[PDB]
Amino acid sequence: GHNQVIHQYFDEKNTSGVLVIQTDKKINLYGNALSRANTEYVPASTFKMLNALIGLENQKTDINEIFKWKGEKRSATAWEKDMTLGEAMKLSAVPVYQELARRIGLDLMQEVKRIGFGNAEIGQQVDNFWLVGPLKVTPIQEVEFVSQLAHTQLPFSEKVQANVKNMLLLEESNGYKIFGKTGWAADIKPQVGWLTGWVEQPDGKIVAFALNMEMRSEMPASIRNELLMKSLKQLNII
Ligand SMILES: *C(=O)[C@@H]([C@@H]1NC(C(=O)O)=C(S[C@H]2CN[C@@H](C(=O)N(C)C)C2)[C@@H]1C)[C@@H](C)O
């Protein structure tokens, strides 16, 4: 797998991003803008993985609790229904995890400094610190986080991590499995899109990734998966 084809996938999408990969504590960089791997961006919709872990661990919820939609007009129309913590993970429904963050509370949430995620600061507003700061995390710190979650090595209960892991399955073909969570901080300039997860190769081998790239409103949501899937195809991970 050349480190140069990576460039022309990103050259052709007219973007500026990096694809971090980790295979058992050996990290390789892959992008047309490799410097972004050590650059702090807001975590956006990816924080839902740590929000679910902190909630399920502290028993502020469970994998079964159904969240009632109480009428208000939400961003996308697929969010306007009752759903559980898992279905809200797939749809990235923000209002659900906000109510969970209020159950946890700012004091208990500021667990974040114990896990050592990003700059480890959440400010005062407990329901929008991952969307416009003051929380920022580097794509290297992200790929290390999901690497521990896949190997079931995060500082939480073993049953809690495996529950969050089951909420993150995206594609299961050819004995492979690809877990991950998407993000898109559309409210900051320049915009930034995420796609952090891992690959469960058929032999159980684990390869974690953390795709970071600048976003624009005109891009499709399937521009992140398209860019990643053709890169794991090239690196012979799938
Ligand atoms: C998390 O970034 C937001 C949540 N996640 C998310 C995504 O990354 O897919 C969408 S934003 C993105 C999805 N399509 C675009 C759109 O608004 N439509 C075409 C409907 C933008 C979603 C908002 C969380 C902060 O809401």
PDB file of C-alpha atoms and ligand atoms in Angstrom:
ATOM      1  CA  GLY A   1       0.000   0.000   0.000  1.00  0.00           C
ATOM      2  CA  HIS A   2       1.594   3.203  -1.221  1.00  0.00           C
ATOM      3  CA  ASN A   3       1.476   6.346   0.873  1.00  0.00           C
ATOM      4  CA  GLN A   4       1.088   8.217  -2.443  1.00  0.00           C
ATOM      5  CA  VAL A   5      -2.241   6.876  -3.769  1.00  0.00           C
ATOM      6  CA  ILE A   6      -3.777   8.204  -0.520  1.00  0.00           C
ATOM      7  CA  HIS A   7      -2.898  11.638  -1.775  1.00  0.00           C
ATOM      8  CA  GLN A   8      -4.807  11.344  -5.066  1.00  0.00           C
ATOM      9  CA  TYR A   9      -7.964  10.088  -3.377  1.00  0.00           C
ATOM     10  CA  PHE A  10      -7.890  13.337  -1.383  1.00  0.00           C
ATOM     11  CA  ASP A  11      -6.642  15.386  -4.345  1.00  0.00           C
ATOM     12  CA  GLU A  12      -9.756  14.415  -6.275  1.00  0.00           C
ATOM     13  CA  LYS A  13     -12.302  15.124  -3.524  1.00  0.00           C
ATOM     14  CA  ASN A  14     -10.851  18.679  -3.302  1.00  0.00           C
ATOM     15  CA  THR A  15     -10.416  18.426   0.461  1.00  0.00           C
ATOM     16  CA  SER A  16      -7.653  18.505   3.080  1.00  0.00           C
ATOM     17  CA  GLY A  17      -7.511  15.645   5.569  1.00  0.00           C
ATOM     18  CA  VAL A  18      -5.635  12.762   7.174  1.00  0.00           C
ATOM     19  CA  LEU A  19      -6.302   9.040   7.719  1.00  0.00           C
ATOM     20  CA  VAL A  20      -4.660   7.756  10.903  1.00  0.00           C
ATOM     21  CA  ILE A  21      -4.199   3.984  11.229  1.00  0.00           C
ATOM     22  CA  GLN A  22      -3.033   1.944  14.227  1.00  0.00           C
ATOM     23  CA  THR A  23      -2.111  -1.761  14.193  1.00  0.00           C
ATOM     24  CA  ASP A  24      -1.005  -2.822  17.699  1.00  0.00           C
ATOM     25  CA  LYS A  25       0.561   0.475  18.830  1.00  0.00           C
ATOM     26  CA  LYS A  26       2.254   1.209  15.475  1.00  0.00           C
ATOM     27  CA  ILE A  27       0.716   4.295  13.867  1.00  0.00           C
ATOM     28  CA  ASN A  28       1.017   5.269  10.191  1.00  0.00           C
ATOM     29  CA  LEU A  29      -0.157   8.578   8.735  1.00  0.00           C
ATOM     30  CA  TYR A  30      -2.107   8.822   5.475  1.00  0.00           C
ATOM     31  CA  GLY A  31      -3.342  12.092   3.968  1.00  0.00           C
ATOM     32  CA  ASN A  32      -2.896  14.989   1.608  1.00  0.00           C
ATOM     33  CA  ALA A  33      -2.618  17.135   4.777  1.00  0.00           C
ATOM     34  CA  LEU A  34      -0.705  14.961   7.247  1.00  0.00           C
ATOM     35  CA  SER A  35      -0.269  17.810   9.749  1.00  0.00           C
ATOM     36  CA  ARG A  36      -3.940  17.525  10.777  1.00  0.00           C
ATOM     37  CA  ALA A  37      -3.178  14.372  12.791  1.00  0.00           C
ATOM     38  CA  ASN A  38      -1.671  16.516  15.568  1.00  0.00           C
ATOM     39  CA  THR A  39      -4.241  19.327  15.223  1.00  0.00           C
ATOM     40  CA  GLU A  40      -7.013  19.800  17.789  1.00  0.00           C
ATOM     41  CA  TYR A  41     -10.558  19.825  16.407  1.00  0.00           C
ATOM     42  CA  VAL A  42     -13.876  19.602  18.208  1.00  0.00           C
ATOM     43  CA  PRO A  43     -14.968  15.932  18.486  1.00  0.00           C
ATOM     44  CA  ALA A  44     -18.533  16.552  17.210  1.00  0.00           C
ATOM     45  CA  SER A  45     -20.835  13.540  16.746  1.00  0.00           C
ATOM     46  CA  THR A  46     -17.975  11.165  17.617  1.00  0.00           C
ATOM     47  CA  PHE A  47     -18.181  12.061  21.326  1.00  0.00           C
ATOM     48  CA  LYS A  48     -21.319   9.895  21.526  1.00  0.00           C
ATOM     49  CA  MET A  49     -19.064   6.885  22.083  1.00  0.00           C
ATOM     50  CA  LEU A  50     -17.595   8.339  25.264  1.00  0.00           C
ATOM     51  CA  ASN A  51     -20.954   9.814  26.276  1.00  0.00           C
ATOM     52  CA  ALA A  52     -22.568   6.369  26.107  1.00  0.00           C
ATOM     53  CA  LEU A  53     -19.688   4.788  28.030  1.00  0.00           C
ATOM     54  CA  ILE A  54     -19.864   7.350  30.849  1.00  0.00           C
ATOM     55  CA  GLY A  55     -23.645   7.045  31.002  1.00  0.00           C
ATOM     56  CA  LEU A  56     -23.914   3.257  30.956  1.00  0.00           C
ATOM     57  CA  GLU A  57     -21.042   2.925  33.440  1.00  0.00           C
ATOM     58  CA  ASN A  58     -22.576   5.351  35.953  1.00  0.00           C
ATOM     59  CA  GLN A  59     -26.049   3.783  35.455  1.00  0.00           C
ATOM     60  CA  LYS A  60     -27.748   6.970  34.309  1.00  0.00           C
ATOM     61  CA  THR A  61     -29.358   4.836  31.580  1.00  0.00           C
ATOM     62  CA  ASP A  62     -29.228   1.404  29.986  1.00  0.00           C
ATOM     63  CA  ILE A  63     -29.215  -0.070  26.485  1.00  0.00           C
ATOM     64  CA  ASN A  64     -32.990  -0.588  26.758  1.00  0.00           C
ATOM     65  CA  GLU A  65     -34.406   2.761  27.935  1.00  0.00           C
ATOM     66  CA  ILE A  66     -36.616   4.252  25.224  1.00  0.00           C
ATOM     67  CA  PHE A  67     -36.456   8.038  24.834  1.00  0.00           C
ATOM     68  CA  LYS A  68     -39.789   9.702  24.090  1.00  0.00           C
ATOM     69  CA  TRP A  69     -39.878  12.312  21.336  1.00  0.00           C
ATOM     70  CA  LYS A  70     -41.882  15.095  22.967  1.00  0.00           C
ATOM     71  CA  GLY A  71     -42.818  17.012  19.802  1.00  0.00           C
ATOM     72  CA  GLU A  72     -40.118  19.575  19.071  1.00  0.00           C
ATOM     73  CA  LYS A  73     -38.813  20.035  15.532  1.00  0.00           C
ATOM     74  CA  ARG A  74     -35.389  18.410  15.196  1.00  0.00           C
ATOM     75  CA  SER A  75     -32.630  18.790  12.613  1.00  0.00           C
ATOM     76  CA  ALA A  76     -33.383  15.713  10.491  1.00  0.00           C
ATOM     77  CA  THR A  77     -36.804  14.099  10.237  1.00  0.00           C
ATOM     78  CA  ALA A  78     -35.514  10.621  11.158  1.00  0.00           C
ATOM     79  CA  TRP A  79     -34.865  11.959  14.694  1.00  0.00           C
ATOM     80  CA  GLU A  80     -38.560  12.656  15.422  1.00  0.00           C
ATOM     81  CA  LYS A  81     -39.486   9.315  16.968  1.00  0.00           C
ATOM     82  CA  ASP A  82     -38.996   7.257  20.093  1.00  0.00           C
ATOM     83  CA  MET A  83     -35.673   5.424  20.128  1.00  0.00           C
ATOM     84  CA  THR A  84     -33.108   3.796  22.401  1.00  0.00           C
ATOM     85  CA  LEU A  85     -29.468   4.671  23.018  1.00  0.00           C
ATOM     86  CA  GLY A  86     -28.343   2.407  20.174  1.00  0.00           C
ATOM     87  CA  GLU A  87     -30.731   3.671  17.510  1.00  0.00           C
ATOM     88  CA  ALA A  88     -29.781   7.220  18.503  1.00  0.00           C
ATOM     89  CA  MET A  89     -26.141   6.227  17.943  1.00  0.00           C
ATOM     90  CA  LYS A  90     -26.779   5.060  14.375  1.00  0.00           C
ATOM     91  CA  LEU A  91     -28.813   8.169  13.509  1.00  0.00           C
ATOM     92  CA  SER A  92     -26.421  10.465  15.440  1.00  0.00           C
ATOM     93  CA  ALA A  93     -29.528  12.008  17.034  1.00  0.00           C
ATOM     94  CA  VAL A  94     -28.058  14.838  19.125  1.00  0.00           C
ATOM     95  CA  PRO A  95     -31.070  15.677  21.386  1.00  0.00           C
ATOM     96  CA  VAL A  96     -31.005  12.165  22.881  1.00  0.00           C
ATOM     97  CA  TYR A  97     -27.386  12.281  24.066  1.00  0.00           C
ATOM     98  CA  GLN A  98     -27.955  15.829  25.329  1.00  0.00           C
ATOM     99  CA  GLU A  99     -30.541  14.574  27.815  1.00  0.00           C
ATOM    100  CA  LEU A 100     -28.072  11.870  28.830  1.00  0.00           C
ATOM    101  CA  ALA A 101     -25.384  14.505  29.377  1.00  0.00           C
ATOM    102  CA  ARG A 102     -27.721  16.422  31.681  1.00  0.00           C
ATOM    103  CA  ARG A 103     -28.401  13.252  33.683  1.00  0.00           C
ATOM    104  CA  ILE A 104     -24.655  12.753  34.104  1.00  0.00           C
ATOM    105  CA  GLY A 105     -24.074  16.360  35.116  1.00  0.00           C
ATOM    106  CA  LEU A 106     -21.166  18.718  34.610  1.00  0.00           C
ATOM    107  CA  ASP A 107     -19.367  17.571  37.768  1.00  0.00           C
ATOM    108  CA  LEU A 108     -19.506  13.847  36.994  1.00  0.00           C
ATOM    109  CA  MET A 109     -18.798  14.496  33.306  1.00  0.00           C
ATOM    110  CA  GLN A 110     -15.606  16.434  34.097  1.00  0.00           C
ATOM    111  CA  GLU A 111     -14.772  11.186  34.112  1.00  0.00           C
ATOM    112  CA  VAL A 112     -13.436  13.015  31.042  1.00  0.00           C
ATOM    113  CA  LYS A 113     -10.203  14.002  32.790  1.00  0.00           C
ATOM    114  CA  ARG A 114      -9.883  10.435  34.105  1.00  0.00           C
ATOM    115  CA  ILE A 115     -10.002   8.948  30.602  1.00  0.00           C
ATOM    116  CA  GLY A 116      -7.758  11.752  29.321  1.00  0.00           C
ATOM    117  CA  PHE A 117      -9.776  12.608  26.209  1.00  0.00           C
ATOM    118  CA  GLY A 118      -8.615  15.585  24.157  1.00  0.00           C
ATOM    119  CA  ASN A 119      -7.788  18.731  26.094  1.00  0.00           C
ATOM    120  CA  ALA A 120     -10.080  17.376  28.861  1.00  0.00           C
ATOM    121  CA  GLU A 121     -12.086  20.596  29.297  1.00  0.00           C
ATOM    122  CA  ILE A 122     -15.855  20.932  28.921  1.00  0.00           C
ATOM    123  CA  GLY A 123     -16.538  24.471  30.118  1.00  0.00           C
ATOM    124  CA  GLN A 124     -19.850  25.037  31.891  1.00  0.00           C
ATOM    125  CA  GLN A 125     -22.544  24.083  29.365  1.00  0.00           C
ATOM    126  CA  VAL A 126     -22.728  20.289  29.707  1.00  0.00           C
ATOM    127  CA  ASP A 127     -24.862  19.823  26.571  1.00  0.00           C
ATOM    128  CA  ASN A 128     -22.790  21.449  23.805  1.00  0.00           C
ATOM    129  CA  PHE A 129     -19.109  21.346  24.766  1.00  0.00           C
ATOM    130  CA  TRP A 130     -18.292  18.719  22.107  1.00  0.00           C
ATOM    131  CA  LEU A 131     -19.901  20.704  19.261  1.00  0.00           C
ATOM    132  CA  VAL A 132     -18.332  24.179  19.586  1.00  0.00           C
ATOM    133  CA  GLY A 133     -15.668  23.629  22.234  1.00  0.00           C
ATOM    134  CA  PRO A 134     -14.024  23.964  24.601  1.00  0.00           C
ATOM    135  CA  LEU A 135     -13.378  20.256  23.944  1.00  0.00           C
ATOM    136  CA  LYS A 136     -10.892  19.464  21.174  1.00  0.00           C
ATOM    137  CA  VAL A 137      -9.163  16.185  20.311  1.00  0.00           C
ATOM    138  CA  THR A 138      -6.479  15.228  17.755  1.00  0.00           C
ATOM    139  CA  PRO A 139      -7.093  12.445  15.201  1.00  0.00           C
ATOM    140  CA  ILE A 140      -4.216  10.521  16.798  1.00  0.00           C
ATOM    141  CA  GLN A 141      -5.862  10.691  20.219  1.00  0.00           C
ATOM    142  CA  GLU A 142      -9.065   9.468  18.549  1.00  0.00           C
ATOM    143  CA  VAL A 143      -7.564   6.409  16.853  1.00  0.00           C
ATOM    144  CA  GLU A 144      -5.942   5.467  20.176  1.00  0.00           C
ATOM    145  CA  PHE A 145      -9.311   5.773  21.936  1.00  0.00           C
ATOM    146  CA  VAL A 146     -11.222   3.523  19.527  1.00  0.00           C
ATOM    147  CA  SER A 147      -8.226   1.174  19.575  1.00  0.00           C
ATOM    148  CA  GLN A 148      -8.759   0.637  23.307  1.00  0.00           C
ATOM    149  CA  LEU A 149     -12.525   0.287  22.891  1.00  0.00           C
ATOM    150  CA  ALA A 150     -12.120  -2.410  20.232  1.00  0.00           C
ATOM    151  CA  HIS A 151      -9.596  -4.381  22.309  1.00  0.00           C
ATOM    152  CA  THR A 152     -11.957  -3.855  25.307  1.00  0.00           C
ATOM    153  CA  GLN A 153      -9.268  -1.939  27.210  1.00  0.00           C
ATOM    154  CA  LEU A 154     -10.931   1.331  28.139  1.00  0.00           C
ATOM    155  CA  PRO A 155     -11.130   2.299  31.835  1.00  0.00           C
ATOM    156  CA  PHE A 156     -14.741   1.099  32.090  1.00  0.00           C
ATOM    157  CA  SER A 157     -16.554  -2.133  32.840  1.00  0.00           C
ATOM    158  CA  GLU A 158     -16.078  -4.940  30.333  1.00  0.00           C
ATOM    159  CA  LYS A 159     -19.840  -5.303  29.827  1.00  0.00           C
ATOM    160  CA  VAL A 160     -20.241  -1.560  29.227  1.00  0.00           C
ATOM    161  CA  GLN A 161     -17.678  -1.366  26.423  1.00  0.00           C
ATOM    162  CA  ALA A 162     -19.078  -4.411  24.620  1.00  0.00           C
ATOM    163  CA  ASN A 163     -22.500  -2.735  24.686  1.00  0.00           C
ATOM    164  CA  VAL A 164     -21.203   0.461  23.068  1.00  0.00           C
ATOM    165  CA  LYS A 165     -19.287  -1.707  20.595  1.00  0.00           C
ATOM    166  CA  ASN A 166     -22.555  -3.350  19.532  1.00  0.00           C
ATOM    167  CA  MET A 167     -24.027   0.095  18.816  1.00  0.00           C
ATOM    168  CA  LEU A 168     -21.290   0.900  16.292  1.00  0.00           C
ATOM    169  CA  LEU A 169     -21.475  -1.877  13.684  1.00  0.00           C
ATOM    170  CA  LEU A 170     -21.726  -0.407  10.178  1.00  0.00           C
ATOM    171  CA  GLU A 171     -20.861  -3.043   7.549  1.00  0.00           C
ATOM    172  CA  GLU A 172     -20.400  -6.828   7.905  1.00  0.00           C
ATOM    173  CA  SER A 173     -19.313  -8.494   4.652  1.00  0.00           C
ATOM    174  CA  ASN A 174     -16.864 -11.273   3.741  1.00  0.00           C
ATOM    175  CA  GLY A 175     -16.314 -12.182   7.400  1.00  0.00           C
ATOM    176  CA  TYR A 176     -15.000  -8.646   7.959  1.00  0.00           C
ATOM    177  CA  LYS A 177     -16.599  -6.157  10.336  1.00  0.00           C
ATOM    178  CA  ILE A 178     -16.269  -2.368  10.308  1.00  0.00           C
ATOM    179  CA  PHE A 179     -17.287  -0.392  13.387  1.00  0.00           C
ATOM    180  CA  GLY A 180     -17.263   3.385  13.492  1.00  0.00           C
ATOM    181  CA  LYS A 181     -19.058   6.638  14.163  1.00  0.00           C
ATOM    182  CA  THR A 182     -19.410   9.678  11.909  1.00  0.00           C
ATOM    183  CA  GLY A 183     -19.208  13.365  12.733  1.00  0.00           C
ATOM    184  CA  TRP A 184     -19.544  16.756  11.078  1.00  0.00           C
ATOM    185  CA  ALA A 185     -18.922  20.082  12.847  1.00  0.00           C
ATOM    186  CA  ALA A 186     -20.833  22.210  10.347  1.00  0.00           C
ATOM    187  CA  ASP A 187     -21.000  25.240  12.673  1.00  0.00           C
ATOM    188  CA  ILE A 188     -17.263  26.078  12.638  1.00  0.00           C
ATOM    189  CA  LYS A 189     -15.023  27.419   9.881  1.00  0.00           C
ATOM    190  CA  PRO A 190     -13.368  25.623   8.353  1.00  0.00           C
ATOM    191  CA  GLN A 191     -15.727  22.675   8.756  1.00  0.00           C
ATOM    192  CA  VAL A 192     -14.400  19.297   9.872  1.00  0.00           C
ATOM    193  CA  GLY A 193     -15.747  15.791   9.313  1.00  0.00           C
ATOM    194  CA  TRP A 194     -14.877  12.640  11.242  1.00  0.00           C
ATOM    195  CA  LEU A 195     -15.025   8.879  10.763  1.00  0.00           C
ATOM    196  CA  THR A 196     -13.320   7.062  13.648  1.00  0.00           C
ATOM    197  CA  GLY A 197     -13.687   3.319  14.148  1.00  0.00           C
ATOM    198  CA  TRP A 198     -11.889   0.023  13.542  1.00  0.00           C
ATOM    199  CA  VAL A 199     -11.882  -3.075  11.330  1.00  0.00           C
ATOM    200  CA  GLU A 200     -12.451  -6.599  12.683  1.00  0.00           C
ATOM    201  CA  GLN A 201     -10.613  -8.725  10.134  1.00  0.00           C
ATOM    202  CA  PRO A 202     -11.937 -12.301   9.724  1.00  0.00           C
ATOM    203  CA  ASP A 203      -9.149 -13.759  11.893  1.00  0.00           C
ATOM    204  CA  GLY A 204     -10.126 -11.395  14.719  1.00  0.00           C
ATOM    205  CA  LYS A 205      -7.217  -9.048  14.010  1.00  0.00           C
ATOM    206  CA  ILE A 206      -7.962  -5.409  14.832  1.00  0.00           C
ATOM    207  CA  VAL A 207      -7.046  -2.311  12.803  1.00  0.00           C
ATOM    208  CA  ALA A 208      -8.240   1.097  14.037  1.00  0.00           C
ATOM    209  CA  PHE A 209      -8.647   4.241  11.936  1.00  0.00           C
ATOM    210  CA  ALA A 210      -9.533   7.913  12.464  1.00  0.00           C
ATOM    211  CA  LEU A 211     -10.452   9.820   9.292  1.00  0.00           C
ATOM    212  CA  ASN A 212     -10.307  13.610   9.634  1.00  0.00           C
ATOM    213  CA  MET A 213     -11.007  15.968   6.745  1.00  0.00           C
ATOM    214  CA  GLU A 214     -12.197  19.513   6.141  1.00  0.00           C
ATOM    215  CA  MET A 215     -15.860  19.684   5.165  1.00  0.00           C
ATOM    216  CA  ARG A 216     -18.066  21.894   3.029  1.00  0.00           C
ATOM    217  CA  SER A 217     -21.852  22.116   2.998  1.00  0.00           C
ATOM    218  CA  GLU A 218     -22.067  20.855  -0.599  1.00  0.00           C
ATOM    219  CA  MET A 219     -20.398  17.509   0.139  1.00  0.00           C
ATOM    220  CA  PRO A 220     -22.513  14.368   0.558  1.00  0.00           C
ATOM    221  CA  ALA A 221     -22.577  12.476   3.831  1.00  0.00           C
ATOM    222  CA  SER A 222     -21.316   9.466   1.845  1.00  0.00           C
ATOM    223  CA  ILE A 223     -18.090  11.315   0.962  1.00  0.00           C
ATOM    224  CA  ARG A 224     -16.476  10.165   4.219  1.00  0.00           C
ATOM    225  CA  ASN A 225     -17.317   6.473   3.857  1.00  0.00           C
ATOM    226  CA  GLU A 226     -16.421   6.530   0.164  1.00  0.00           C
ATOM    227  CA  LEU A 227     -13.014   8.060   0.901  1.00  0.00           C
ATOM    228  CA  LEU A 228     -12.251   5.615   3.727  1.00  0.00           C
ATOM    229  CA  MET A 229     -13.502   2.406   2.094  1.00  0.00           C
ATOM    230  CA  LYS A 230     -11.334   2.939  -1.002  1.00  0.00           C
ATOM    231  CA  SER A 231      -8.322   3.515   1.285  1.00  0.00           C
ATOM    232  CA  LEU A 232      -8.768   0.392   3.407  1.00  0.00           C
ATOM    233  CA  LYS A 233      -9.268  -1.399   0.083  1.00  0.00           C
ATOM    234  CA  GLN A 234      -5.885  -0.087  -1.100  1.00  0.00           C
ATOM    235  CA  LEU A 235      -4.022  -0.833   2.149  1.00  0.00           C
ATOM    236  CA  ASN A 236      -5.367  -4.405   1.822  1.00  0.00           C
ATOM    237  CA  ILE A 237      -7.222  -4.194   5.135  1.00  0.00           C
ATOM    238  CA  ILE A 238     -10.442  -5.366   3.435  1.00  0.00           C
TER     239      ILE A 238
HETATM  240  C1  LIG B   1     -23.015  15.350  14.583  1.00  0.00           C
HETATM  241  O1  LIG B   1     -22.005  15.867  13.713  1.00  0.00           O
HETATM  242  C2  LIG B   1     -24.375  15.896  14.165  1.00  0.00           C
HETATM  243  C3  LIG B   1     -25.223  14.811  13.490  1.00  0.00           C
HETATM  244  N1  LIG B   1     -24.262  13.982  12.764  1.00  0.00           N
HETATM  245  C4  LIG B   1     -24.320  14.074  11.509  1.00  0.00           C
HETATM  246  C5  LIG B   1     -23.396  13.370  10.627  1.00  0.00           C
HETATM  247  O2  LIG B   1     -22.167  13.549  10.769  1.00  0.00           O
HETATM  248  O3  LIG B   1     -23.864  12.611   9.750  1.00  0.00           O
HETATM  249  C6  LIG B   1     -25.412  14.970  11.037  1.00  0.00           C
HETATM  250  S1  LIG B   1     -24.758  16.446  10.318  1.00  0.00           S
HETATM  251  C7  LIG B   1     -24.658  16.272   8.561  1.00  0.00           C
HETATM  252  C8  LIG B   1     -25.549  15.128   8.095  1.00  0.00           C
HETATM  253  N2  LIG B   1     -26.087  15.529   6.784  1.00  0.00           N
HETATM  254  C9  LIG B   1     -26.120  17.007   6.736  1.00  0.00           C
HETATM  255  C10 LIG B   1     -27.527  17.475   6.981  1.00  0.00           C
HETATM  256  O4  LIG B   1     -27.774  18.237   7.900  1.00  0.00           O
HETATM  257  N3  LIG B   1     -28.474  17.006   6.169  1.00  0.00           N
HETATM  258  C11 LIG B   1     -28.251  16.743   4.753  1.00  0.00           C
HETATM  259  C12 LIG B   1     -29.817  16.703   6.643  1.00  0.00           C
HETATM  260  C13 LIG B   1     -25.185  17.506   7.834  1.00  0.00           C
HETATM  261  C14 LIG B   1     -26.129  15.286  12.339  1.00  0.00           C
HETATM  262  C15 LIG B   1     -26.570  16.748  12.378  1.00  0.00           C
HETATM  263  C16 LIG B   1     -25.032  16.554  15.380  1.00  0.00           C
HETATM  264  C17 LIG B   1     -24.280  17.782  15.877  1.00  0.00           C
HETATM  265  O5  LIG B   1     -26.365  16.926  15.020  1.00  0.00           O
END
